Amino acid sequence: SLSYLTEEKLTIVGAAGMIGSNMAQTAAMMRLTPNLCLYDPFAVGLEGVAEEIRHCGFEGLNLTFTSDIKEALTDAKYIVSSGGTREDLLKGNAEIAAQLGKDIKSYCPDCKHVIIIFNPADITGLVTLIYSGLKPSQVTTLAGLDSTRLQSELAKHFGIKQSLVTNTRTYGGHGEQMAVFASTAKVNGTPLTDLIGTDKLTNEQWAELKQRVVKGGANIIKLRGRSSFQSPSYVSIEMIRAAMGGEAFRWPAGCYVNVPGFEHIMMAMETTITKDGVKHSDINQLGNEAERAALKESYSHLAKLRDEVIAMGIIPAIADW
Amino acid sequence: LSYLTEEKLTIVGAAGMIGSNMAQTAAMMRLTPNLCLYDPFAVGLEGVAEEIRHCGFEGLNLTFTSDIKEALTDAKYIVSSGGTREDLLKGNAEIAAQLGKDIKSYCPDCKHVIIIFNPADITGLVTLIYSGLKPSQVTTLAGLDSTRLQSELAKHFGIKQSLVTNTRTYGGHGEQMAVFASTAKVNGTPLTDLIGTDKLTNEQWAELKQRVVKGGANIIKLRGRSSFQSPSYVSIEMIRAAMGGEAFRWPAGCYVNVPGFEHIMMAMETTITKDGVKHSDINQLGNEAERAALKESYSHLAKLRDEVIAMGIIPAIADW
């Protein structure tokens, strides 16, 4: 085995669930830290999860579990949370995200990085950042699944090994609000934009393929009988590994953006997460002009949702940030 | 790192909670790019393959299928969680026989097979017999009783789990497990010097053992379903060892046929390597009292074996 990447405490919030439990197993396999702490309000489900992890026999693991948030966040340096009417779910998740920020502020204001994966992640991630008191470089959201699903759907269409479709990228919002930057991708060396609208990938096939990405989460539900839990788990934990100084993470992440044309928002971006946190590349040089316009469209929907949550009084007036 | 091998690994029962976790673990471990997922429930299976594809494992060449011939063709490694009491026994015995027949037809050159559906002493043995393989090529998952005993002892003493060393149960599982306490140390101190003392009383040890025996029922009470992460994780650790990665030394179920313990598959002191499974000398295992406990477990396993012979599924021992 490799040595553990760090001794600092990693806390998983939402650990009793199908996603959080898989995260626990993934973090332990990756040997990120021996000090892995599992938090969930659901104490009985949590205990069953911890018992399962203990029975894997991970060498050197110091697993802890708790339903007390102070205990869970004390000494925490990394945190990953899956602990999540339309207005009611929106408000409900924005409120749990604010409370997570306040808790980070009270119990671990020196936290290094925090990843929020519960939806709607543009709001939850931004609310957590604001209430947590952390720098923008310290908070990201899971946003890479649109890109891995695009990669998969392209590899299936072309009947080739998935890894041969390189640099597939969506930016902005997710699902219906994703912005596909096809100019970034190659299919076994050939630019995707040379293939779209040819006999090898017709206009209509491309539309249908994009729609299978948009509906990718519904499709897992229809096939598995429950929401996806292994992919969001694994990808999120690869993200926190990068933030902890491990192997770099090679897919878009959600991060804070505030530049002319895209002000005061959290969006899926071309990011790199390292021990120094997250940074994003220059939006003005992303893709081509048409793709940037699609990104602006996605931006406009995100900005409307942000303003709803300001109106609920949860996110402060932008002028007050 | 680099993939451990290019040879094909097939997971049978891949649509389930255990199988799907096995798929992710095998991909994470980079055992082989050629990971093949089989299950007769094609819709459930596709959803698992989709999740795995959406993790983005570099270089993975995932396939899935509900066709046993396609799944077993070119397979060199196989892990299966593809499973009245007499009816559950027979049904599982019959699926274990069909798996053996299938291996013999489609991949008689398979290197190693791990059977994890219960009752593993019977399923493992039936698969071995029907598969045509050597005894060094078939194992069953049998280590959770040892890891549970490690965890329960560490919880007792309030120390880090890895500091409880060399905890071992042999023989059957759960109610039929045989605890070999003489093998274990608690942070350097022989377990047998702790049992019956102030630091672990007679009654606390009885209760601790029972928490191991009922470990599976406990996970069900707590999670609301049977364990799936630990059986998956430990089993793929075993196949990694068979594929030539880090050796696997928790107990595994394997074929034993020696005086006092004839014609049976039992959890043993085993090592799995690129050369398959070997077990140590039973007569040197633990002390005389513990070997007697192990003989009791053997007696129960032998009765079960003979029931499956009487069903005409396992041939007469004289015909092996």
- Residue B298 CA to residue B266 CA, distance in Å, equals 8
Nearest to A273 by CA among A139, A91, A170: A139
Q: Using an 8 Å Cβ cutoff, are A235 and A251 in contact?
A: yes
A116 conformational bin, left if phi > 0, alpha if psi -120 to 50, beta if neither: beta
- Distances in Å between the Cα of B272 and the Cα atoms of A145, B280, B300 are 37, 12, 26
**How much is the CA Rg of chain A, to the nearest whole Å?**
20
Q: Where are the alpha helices (H) located in chain B, listed in sequence order?
A: 17-28, 42-55, 68-72, 85-106, 120-131, 144-157, 202-213, 215-223, 229-242, 288-310
CB B238 within 8 A of CB B252: yes
Contact yes or no for B296/B105 (Cβ under 8 A): no
DSSP structural state of residue B252: E
- Please count the residues of chain A: 321
> Rounded CA gap, B14 and B27, in Å?
13
Name residue B258's beta-bridge partners.
B261
DSSP A287-304: S-HHHHHHHHHHHHHHHH
Tell me how far CA of residue B231 lies from CA of A73, A75, B238, in angstroms.
Answer: 30, 32, 11
Inter-chain CB proximity B56 and A148 less than 8 Å: yes
CA gap B99, B96 in Å, rounded:
5
Choosing from A157, A174, A264, A280, which is the catalytic residue?
A: A174
Cα Rg of chain B, angstroms: 20
Angle at A30 (CA atoms; ends A29, A35), nearest 5 degrees: 85
- The amino acid that residue A303 corresponds to is A
**Nearest Cα to A96, choosing from A70, A119, A71, A64?**
A119
Minimal Cβ distance to A55: which of B52, B53, B151: B151
Question: Under the phi-then-psi rule, with left for phi > 0, alpha for psi from -120 to 50, and beta for the rest, what region is B16?
Answer: beta
- Residue in A51, A62, A225 closest to B219 by CB: A51
Q: Say which residues have a Cβ less than 8 Å from residue A299's Cβ, sequence separation at least 6.
A: A172, A261, A262, A265, A267
Residue B169, helix vs strand vs coil:
strand
Rounded Cα–Cα distance for residues A239 and B174 (Å): 39
Q: How far apart are the first and last CA of chain A?
A: 45
Question: What's the order of all strands across the beta sheet hosting A186-187?
Answer: A165-166, A186-187, A190-191
Please state whether A203 falls in left (phi above 0), alpha (psi between -120 and 50) or beta. Answer: alpha
Q: Distance, in angstroms, between A159 CA and closest chain B CA?
A: 11
Tokens of A84: 């999540």
* Orientation of helix B202-213 relative to helix B144-157, angle to 10°: 140
Q: Taking a C-beta distance cutoff of 8 angstroms, is the pair B61, B34 a contact?
A: yes
* Omega before A34 within 30 of 0, i.e. cis: no
Residue of A nearest to B26 (CA): A29
Q: How far is A58 from A61, CA to CA, in rounded Å? A: 6
CB B116 within 8 A of CB B18: yes
CA pair distance A303, A257, nearest whole angstrom: 12
Angstrom distance (rounded) from CA B5 to CA B34: 9
How far apart are alpha carbons B133 and B130 in whole angstroms? 8
Using the Cβ of A26 and the Cβ atoms of chain B, whether some distance falls under 8 Å is answered with yes
- Resolution of this model in Å is 1.9
Q: Taking a C-beta distance cutoff of 8 angstroms, is the pair A122, A172 a contact?
A: no
- φ/ψ of residue B277, rounded to 5: -100, 140
Query: Which has the closest alpha carbon to B49: B15, B74, B9?
Result: B15
- Half-sphere exposure for B15 (CA within 13 Å, toward CB): 19
DSSP state of A198: B
Is B271:B278 a contact under the CB 8 Å cutoff?
A: yes
Distance between CA B250 and CA B319 in Å, rounded?
Answer: 32
Six-digit token pair at A248?
């770099």
Say whether A117 counts as a known binding-site residue.
yes
Q: How many angstroms from the chain centroid is the CA of residue B280?
A: 18
Q: For residue B224, give every residue at least 6 positions away whose Cβ sits within 8 Å of its Cβ, in sequence order, or none.
A: A45, A48
| Rounded Cα distance, A147 and A252, in Å | 7
Residue identified by tokens 């928790």 is: B250
Q: Is B150 at the interface with chain A, CB within 8 A?
A: yes
Residue B254 distance to chain A (closest CA, Å): 20
Q: How crowded is the C-beta side of A261, counted as CA atoms within 13 Å?
A: 11
Element holding A268 (H helix, E strand): strand A262-269
Which residue shows structure tokens 């090592």? B271
SS3 at position A63: coil
CA torsion sign for B109, B110, B111, B116 is negative
CA distances to A138, A268, B36 from A148, rounded to whole Å, are 24, 13, 20
* B window 93-132, beta carbon within 8 A of A: none
**B78/B110 Cα distance (integer angstroms):** 8
Determine the Cα–Cα distance for residues B156 and A232; give it in Å rounded to an integer: 35
A215 three-class SS: coil
DSSP A89-135: HHHHHHHHHHHHHHHHHHH-TT--EEEE-SSSHHHHHHHHHHHHT--
Q: What is the DSSP string of A230-241?
A: HHHHHHHHHHHH
- B170, B269 contact by CB (below 8 A): yes
Best interface-test mutation with B: which of A19, A51, A59, A117 has the largest number of B CBs within 10 A?
A51
Largest CA distance in chain B: 59
* Distance, C-alpha B177 to centroid of its chain: 14
Chain B residue numbers with beta carbons less than 8 Å from the beta carbon of A220 are 47, 50-51
B residues 210..249 contacting A (CB < 8 A): 215, 218-219, 221-224, 227-230, 233-234, 246
Residues 31-70 on A with a CB inside 8 Å of B are 44-45, 47-49, 51-57, 59-63
Confirm or reject contact between A29 and chain B (CB < 8 A). yes
Displacement of CA B184 from its chain's centroid (Å): 21
CA distance B268 to A90: 55
Report CA-CA distances (Å) from B273 to B124, B181, B238: 18, 26, 9
Q: Which residues of B266-282 are buried (b: 16+ CB within 10 A; e: fewer)?
A: bbbbbebbeebbebeeb
Nearest to B191 by CA among B159, B229, B227, B235: B159
Beta bridge partners of B265: B255
The length of chain B in residues reads 320
Instruction: Name B314's Cβ contacts closer than 8 Å, sequence gap at least 6.
Output: B93, B125, B126, B129, B305, B308
Residue A148 to residue A236: CA distance in whole angstroms: 13
B300 is catalytic: no
How far apart CA B19 and CA B66 sit, in angstroms, is 14
Please report the number of interchain residue pairs, chain A to chain B, with beta-carbon separation below 8 angstroms: 128
Paired with B11 in beta bridges are B37, B79
CA of B137: how far to CAs of B89, B92, B171, in Å? 23, 20, 19
Quick one: CA dihedral A285, A291, A296, A302, positive or negative?
Answer: negative
Q: Which chain B residues are within 8 Å of A145, Cβ to Cβ?
A: 54
The Cα B309–Cα B293 span in angstroms is: 25
Angle value at C-alpha A71, between A66 and A75, nearest 5 degrees: 125
Q: Which of A134, A129, A138 is nearest to A275 (CA)?
A: A138
DSSP single-letter state for residue B199: T
- For B148, the token pair is 């549970």
Closest CA to A179 of A262, A279, A259, A237: A262
Record: contact A216-B28, CB cut-off 8 A: no
**Where do the domains of chain B lie, and which CATH numbers do they carry?**
1-142 (3.40.50.720), 143-320 (3.90.110.10)
Q: What is the dihedral of CA A26, A30, A36, A40, to 10 degrees?
A: -10
Dihedral sign (CA A188, A189, A195, A200): negative
Instruction: With CA atoms as reference, report the closest residue to B71 among B37, B34, B20.
Output: B37
Calpha distance A206→A141 (Å, rounded): 27
Phi, psi at A250, each rounded to 5°: -105, 35
Beta bridge partners of A262: A259
Contacts of B151 in chain A (CB under 8 A): 51, 54-55
Taking CA–CA distances from B43, the nearest residue in chain A reads A223
Quick check: A235 and B28 in contact, CB under 8 A? no
The closest alpha carbon to A287, from A211, A214, A192, belongs to A192
What tokens appear for A306 in the block? 């942000």
Task: List the alpha helices (DSSP H) in chain A.
Answer: 18-29, 43-56, 69-73, 86-107, 121-132, 145-158, 203-214, 216-224, 230-243, 289-311
